[PDB]
RNA sequence: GAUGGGGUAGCAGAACGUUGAGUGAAUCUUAGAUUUUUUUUUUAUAACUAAAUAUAGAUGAUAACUCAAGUGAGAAUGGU
């Protein structure tokens, strides 16, 4: 009213729009404090940060929207990553390495490092809001983005019935990940599972875009350099994403293939057997070697533990902890290329 | 390495490296003066929409 | 047969690889009619302009609040809020104020207990009896 | 220019435009007291 | 913090040591010379090396509200080495709060009720601190009058040979050898 | 209270706890208990 | 008792209690949603202001 | 989801002391397991907690709508044979609810309420006192039985959330020093 | 500058080699055990420091692993290893008050206390190659 | 104590002593190694690849074995024809010859029994039975050391023990 | 890279708070003034942020400076 005047001046047909026009985002103070927040360069302009807050659940259009820009940071995020695990840890097995890539560049991950660059979520998405608002629906589920993984033919009998999928086939058919391929408004109500889900979903969209914005403004160099101290800078235990079936023979399997003289447990120490709390060290030897050491309770767990610490000192086995990765090379020119130890895949058994 | 500073007495005074070694105080009455990106900066920056990374970079 | 757990997510460590300035907004009340805004309505005429081009990261939002004292709120990045009133105080005063929301982060205050705060495993292995020499009672 | 109330907080967010809709559809004010008068049972009986 | 960042199991874990009171100790003994006449530890001297044990003090994690203490077990307190006349001269006095109930009774008459384990216990209980945690740590010593006792498969053992053992520390050094050859 | 004379509004409802007990009626929520615009 | 009669029918939805089959108030003996003689008729004297 | 009626009783002519011991009996149990150990008290008060508690009774089935579905949960048990539920109280009484719509005392307190009279003690050499008559009140707090259905399984998550017990815990060691003494 | 001792050139490719490394780092000469990633809280404002600066450690006394230390005299030469902070900003603790008061005297005297405290962060913490010393 | 000074220093306890014989007019490189446990990141010698430079003899080399707890031994005595045998029995009267019956009688572990032959699914379900029928039997107390049991299975399988 | 730092009787200086008053026919308030609470922050006998509950347009509240005091209570076998 005339006592209170609107704050922002706007036309009137502003709250009709899906997104603010990109003319909004050069007076916004959010805009200016989070492209300095993160020292981008000034080769990036506030339209196309602006453009990369824009969830396509928010803009149907494909311009104004920020499904593309997701796509191309995707792809340079999980690649980076990839290359980076391999070198790192040449001898994980497939399953782990998937757990490991969606620990670092998962929906989870990223809704934690958008949510530590200050970025606040907006109501409702409309042309009122201020530019420097992640704007997304999150009641619209029929956003997705394309994934280079295929549907598989089973996947109606996969989880209805239980089918077995397998491991070999995920690298081809599933997602980068390892997930499966397409596994008025009334605002009185609660929060949903599936909103949760569409909310995190919005928050990865934004931080993979700022990598795609990255690489088409500043080049592959600049956008490398981002991933690498954003993304690959977090910590994380990959010996904490082991489970164990049956170690022991998984372990006699291993030493059979690299012709390891067969596994003997020995216990190196106890103390307190007829006990409450007792305490058995035992380790698994080959020979004279001594390939791992387990200290538990019980004279089974300690062998058991004992055989999936030999395990992991075998999966876990890093060349270096900062390893030369096979993308230095495009760049400028740099020492020549040493070929990277190729581990023979993980150890099947019974 | 320090980060941009403003000083009372004398000042804004820019980010240094000493590791490649400069402290410059830049004062003024005017945005352009203190020597940081206003609003006029961020609109031309907006309005070169030809600059473009060579093909090779990308 | 290894099985991962996909219920372990990377923690993230601010300040390796790249910082990010937690302050990520300033707002400035003051009153136009309020004898103790005399100093804050300095501050925002010869040492805000200055303080906030020299913090580029930093969203500043003045606005009015008559019949009200003048306060310093700070918004974090880990939701919380810090709000200072700087009633009465002259603006050189406001500005020692303002760079304690900057350097402070939003994290609830705590008495000192131990410096160091680590999240990595110790390089050498926490003591324990049965990997030594023995000890003879 | 002028003080920042809890409805142009909302604005910004953009929840305010369905505020609107919600009160307006079941008769509630927006930014009023309505046409509803004080009230006057005490009134009534004299009291002061 | 990095220290004290890790598996802290077997750091808290109750090891069973073993002492025989009729051993000779060149550690604890107050004649170091000659090699024979090296006798064993005096009842104070060897009770104070087993309340440092029931404290877990000898431990770098010790804490005194934490009750990190270990098992003691000591054998062959019959023969409880003793210096001067103190079987004989040595009073125990104990009273019930009644006037004229004050119970004496000597070193030697009360080794012939309960032995010579409660001689030790009672020394070792005055060297404990004095709060909640003094009866748990006095029942985590375990003395016995001969060579026999139940916790001969508890004793910690290194390589299947039993600390104080013969060859015992051989044993040991041969397992941190194999330890070395690792990253 | 044993001894107050039971007055019309405890006759009252005593006659309705044995017509919901014994299934005549059937319970249903209050209409009157305010006058709201929302109606939920 | 419209204070907090409007909250509990916000709050219990379909368990809202059916009042108008309560039992009067022992304070002035006025059914729900009944007035009082004195009150309905507007018979209490008052002053000559 | 769970219907509740919090009743106030009338003004009774006794004290807390005495009336807090009649509120005590009736906690937890059934308003029928309660109306039987009121009717059957010494206690001059239980007459009076009897037909108190026979009247938020009533208004628990009028207004609040509780203890409606005796013959239609009595189906499910004998026509279908369905197994009853089995809960355990907060004390650790066993229970087993056949109708989870049967009305019982969740809460129960005593108030003091205004002074019933004022008696005069006159005592030796000419001292007088005065003495107070008391007059008290109860409230009861009624319940279904999904109340408590619901409750024994909140328990019985909180406990099946703690983990099982490890024998070689990992306990922390706080304190900090700048050296390693390992 | 004095070359560094033969048996430290034998040994320190080994140190960096393993998987860890600890330093024993010396602010204003207290030390802290710290690795790269920690985040020291130092019991003092550090005066002419803002959130963002990075500084350059100097003065350790111990650069070891799980297995191998190396201890400087009085300090290890700063040519071995690189190590580096960044300031987090500044953190203060709840406002103390201590009462001073004597038996019979109604006087009690207030201290108010509010310090604050620098918090750092270890970025860097690398063992150099000295094959070229 | 008084104050948390006076607290640290009687809940003091000093560095190792190897980090007590600090040098003289120089620097130094001692071998310390920790009594405490290993990580799975201290790769054995015999895991490394031979392309791996960093395998190198003992870093005490640059300045019998434990008693036997499980050593077993594999016995392949089951011919092909024995096999089909094993098939006939268990099909035909699977009550009388259980899984136990034939591991005696053909010299076998019970579990290869198994891997080479399964029971009819009747006779399955029937023992699924039996063992869920001694499972309400169970009290409060028991029924919750035995879940507890099962659960310390499967946190050491998953790291946590 | 200023100097100084316990305190009774006692002396001295500097301030906060409370009640009323002037500027005040002023300032602000359903876009929530005021709400004995809780909570948050700030060198902090004080105020402040937010939350919850209720609903006032002045017989309301109030910054700042100033004026005047029936102005600050674990202590009087104190009084109600
Ligand atoms: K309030
Ligand atoms: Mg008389
Ligand atoms: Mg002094
Ligand atoms: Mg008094
Ligand atoms: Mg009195």
Redesign the interface.
């Known amino acids: 009213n005339d006592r209170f005047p609107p704050l922002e001046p706007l036309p009137p047909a502003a709250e009709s729009l899906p997104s603010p026009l990109p003319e909004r985002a050069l007076t916004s103070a959010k805009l200016a404090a989070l492209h300095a927040r993160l020292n981008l360069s000034p080769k990036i302009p506030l339209q196309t940060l602006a453009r990369t807050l824009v969830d396509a659940s928010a803009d149907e259009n494909p311009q104004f929207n920020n499904a593309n820009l997701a796509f191309v940071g995707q792809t340079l995020i999980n690649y980076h990553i990839a290359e980076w695990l391999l070198c790192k840890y040449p001898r994980l097995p497939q399953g782990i390495l998937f757990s490991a890539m969606k620990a670092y560049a998962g929906p989870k991950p990223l809704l934690q490092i958008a949510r530590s660059w200050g970025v606040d979520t907006a109501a409702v998405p409309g042309g009122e809001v201020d530019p420097g608002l992640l704007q997304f629906d999150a009641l619209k589920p029929g956003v997705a983005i394309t994934n280079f993984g295929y549907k598989r033919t089973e996947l109606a009998y996969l989880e209805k019935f239980k089918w077995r999928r397998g491991m070999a086939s995920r690298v081809v058919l599933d997602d980068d990940f390892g997930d499966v391929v397409r596994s008025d408004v009334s605002y009185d109500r609660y929060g949903n599972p599936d909103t949760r889900a569409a909310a995190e979903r919005a928050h990865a969209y934004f931080v993979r875009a700022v990598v795609g914005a990255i690489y088409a403004h500043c080049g592959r160099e600049a956008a490398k350099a981002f991933v690498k101290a954003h993304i690959m800078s977090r910590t994380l235990d990959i010996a904490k994403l082991f489970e164990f079936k049956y170690p022991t023979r998984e372990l006699a399997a291993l030493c059979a293939r690299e012709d390891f003289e067969p596994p003997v447990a020995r216990l190196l120490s106890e103390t307190g057997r007829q006990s409450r709390t007792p305490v058995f060290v035992v380790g698994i030897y080959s020979g004279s070697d001594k390939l791992g050491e387990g200290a538990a309770s019980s004279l089974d767990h300690a062998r058991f533990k004992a055989a999936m610490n030999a395990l992991k000192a075998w999966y876990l086995y890093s060349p270096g902890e900062n390893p030369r990765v096979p993308s230095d090379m495009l760049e400028e020119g740099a020492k020549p290329w040493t070929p990277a130890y190729i581990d023979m895949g993980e150890v099947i058994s019974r | 390495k320090q980060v941009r500073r403003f000083i009372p007495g004398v000042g804004v005074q820019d980010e240094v490296d000493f590791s490649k070694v400069g402290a410059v105080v830049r004062d003024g009455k005017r945005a352009g003066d203190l020597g940081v990106r206003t609003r006029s900066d961020w609109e031309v920056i907006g309005k070169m929409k030809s600059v473009l990374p060579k093909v090779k970079a990308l | 047969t290894v099985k991962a757990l996909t219920q372990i997510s990377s923690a993230g460590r601010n300040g390796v690889g790249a910082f990010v300035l937690q302050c990520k907004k300033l707002d400035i009340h003051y009153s136009d009619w309020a004898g103790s805004s005399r100093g804050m309505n300095g501050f925002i005429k010869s040492l805000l302009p200055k303080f906030a081009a020299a913090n580029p990261q930093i969203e500043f939002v003045v606005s009015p609040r008559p019949a009200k004292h003048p306060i310093l709120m700070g918004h974090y990045i880990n939701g919380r809020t810090k709000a200072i009133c700087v009633r009465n105080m002259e603006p050189l005063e406001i500005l020692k104020k303002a760079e304690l929301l900057r350097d402070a982060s939003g994290e609830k205050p705590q008495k000192f207990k131990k410096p160091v705060t680590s999240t990595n495993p110790s390089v050498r292995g926490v003591w324990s009896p049965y990997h030594g020499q023995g000890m003879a009672v | 220019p002028r003080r920042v109330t809890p409805v142009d907080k909302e604005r910004m967010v953009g929840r305010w435009k369905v505020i609107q809709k919600e009160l307006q559809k079941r008769e509630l004010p927006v930014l009023g007291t309505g046409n509803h008068g004080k009230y006057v049972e005490l009134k009534?009986?004299?009291s002061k | 913090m990095s220290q004290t960042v890790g598996a802290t199991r077997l750091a808290y874990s109750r090891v069973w040591h073993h002492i025989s009171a009729v051993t000779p100790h060149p550690t604890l003994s107050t004649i170091k010379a000659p090699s024979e006449a090296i006798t064993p530890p005096s009842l104070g001297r060897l009770a104070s090396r087993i309340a440092t044990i029931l404290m877990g003090k000898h431990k770098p994690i010790w804490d005194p509200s934490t009750d990190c203490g270990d098992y003691v077990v000591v054998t062959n307190c019959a023969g409880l080495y003793t210096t001067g006349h103190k079987k004989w001269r040595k009073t125990y006095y104990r009273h019930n709060t009644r006037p004229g109930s004050l119970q004496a009774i000597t070193m030697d008459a009360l080794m012939e009720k309960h032995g010579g384990a409660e001689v030790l216990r009672k020394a070792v209980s005055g060297m404990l601190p004095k709060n909640r945690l003094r009866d748990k740590r006095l029942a985590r010593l375990k003395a016995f009058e001969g060579d026999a006792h139940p916790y001969k498969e508890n004793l910690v053992r290194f390589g299947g040979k039993v600390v104080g053992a013969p060859g015992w520390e051989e044993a040991v050094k041969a397992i941190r050898e194999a330890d070395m050859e690792r990253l | 209270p044993s001894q107050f004379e039971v007055?019309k509004?405890?006759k009252?409802?005593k006659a309705?706890q044995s017509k919901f007990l014994s299934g005549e009626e059937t319970?249903?929520?209050?209409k009157?208990?305010?006058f709201?615009n929302?109606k939920? | 008792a419209?204070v907090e009669?409007?909250n509990?029918?916000?709050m219990?939805?379909?368990?809202?209690?059916?009042?108008?089959?309560?039992?009067?108030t022992?304070s002035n003996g006025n059914?729900f949603?009944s007035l009082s003689p004195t009150?309905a008729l507007?018979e209490?004297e008052?002053?000559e202001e | 989801?769970e219907?509740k009626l919090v009743y106030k009783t009338?003004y009774l002519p006794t004290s807390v002391k005495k009336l807090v011991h009649l509120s005590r009996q009736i906690r937890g149990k059934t308003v029928s397991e309660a109306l039987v150990q009121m009717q059957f008290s010494k206690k001059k008060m239980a007459k009076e907690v009897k037909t108190e508690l026979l009247?938020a009774e009533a208004?628990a089935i009028?207004?609040?709508?509780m203890g409606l579905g005796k013959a239609a949960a009595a189906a499910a048990q004998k026509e279908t044979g369905a197994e009853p539920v089995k809960i355990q109280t907060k004390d650790g009484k066993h229970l087993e609810i056949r109708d989870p719509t049967r009305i019982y005392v969740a809460e129960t307190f005593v108030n003091k309420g205004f002074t019933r009279g004022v008696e005069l003690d006159y005592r030796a050499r000419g001292r007088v006192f005065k003495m107070n008559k008391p007059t008290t009140t109860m409230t009861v707090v009624l319940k279904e039985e999904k109340t408590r259905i619901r409750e024994h399984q909140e328990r019985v998550a909180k406990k099946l959330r703690q983990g099982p017990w490890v024998h070689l815990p990992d306990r922390p060691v706080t304190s900090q020093r700048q050296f390693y003494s390992w | 500058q004095p070359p560094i001792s033969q048996q430290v050139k034998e040994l320190l490719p080994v140190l960096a080699a393993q998987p860890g490394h600890y330093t024993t780092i010396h602010i204003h000469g207290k030390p802290y055990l710290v690795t790269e990633g920690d985040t020291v809280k130092l019991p003092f404002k550090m005066p002419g420091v803002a959130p963002g600066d990075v500084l350059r450690l100097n003065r350790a006394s111990v650069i070891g692993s799980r297995d191998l230390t190396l201890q400087g005299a009085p300090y290890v030469d700063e040519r071995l290893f690189e190590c580096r902070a960044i300031v987090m900003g500044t953190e203060s603790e709840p406002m103390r008050v201590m009462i001073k008061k004597k038996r019979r005297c109604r006087k009690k005297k207030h201290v108010f206390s509010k310090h604050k405290y620098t918090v750092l962060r270890i970025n860097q913490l690398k063992i150099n190659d000295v094959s070229s010393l | 104590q008084s104050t948390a000074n006076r607290t640290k220093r009687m809940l003091n306890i000093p560095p190792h002593e190897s980090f007590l014989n600090v040098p003289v007019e120089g620097d130094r490189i001692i071998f310390n190694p920790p009594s405490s446990e290993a990580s799975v990141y201290h790769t054995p010698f015999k895991f490394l690849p031979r392309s791996d430079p960093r395998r190198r003899a003992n870093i005490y080399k640059l300045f019998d074995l434990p008693p036997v707890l499980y050593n077993p031994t594999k016995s392949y005595n089951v011919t092909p024809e024995q096999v089909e045998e094993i098939r006939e029995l268990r099909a035909k009267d699977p009550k009388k010859y259980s899984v136990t019956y034939l591991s005696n009688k053909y010299n076998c572990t019970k579990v290869f029994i198994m891997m080479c032959t399964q029971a009819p699914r009747e006779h399955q379900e029937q023992h699924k039975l039996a063992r869920a029928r001694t499972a309400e039997n169970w009290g409060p107390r028991r029924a919750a050391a035995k879940l507890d049991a099962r659960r310390r299975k499967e946190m050491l399988h998953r790291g946590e023990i």
């Open positions: 009534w009986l004299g | 007055t509004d405890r009252a409802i309705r319970w249903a929520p209050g009157v208990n305010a709201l929302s939920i | 419209a009669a409007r509990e029918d916000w219990l939805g379909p368990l809202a209690p059916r009042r108008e089959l309560d039992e009067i022992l059914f949603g009150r507007l209490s008052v002053s | 989801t219907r009338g009247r208004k009028v207004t609040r709508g």
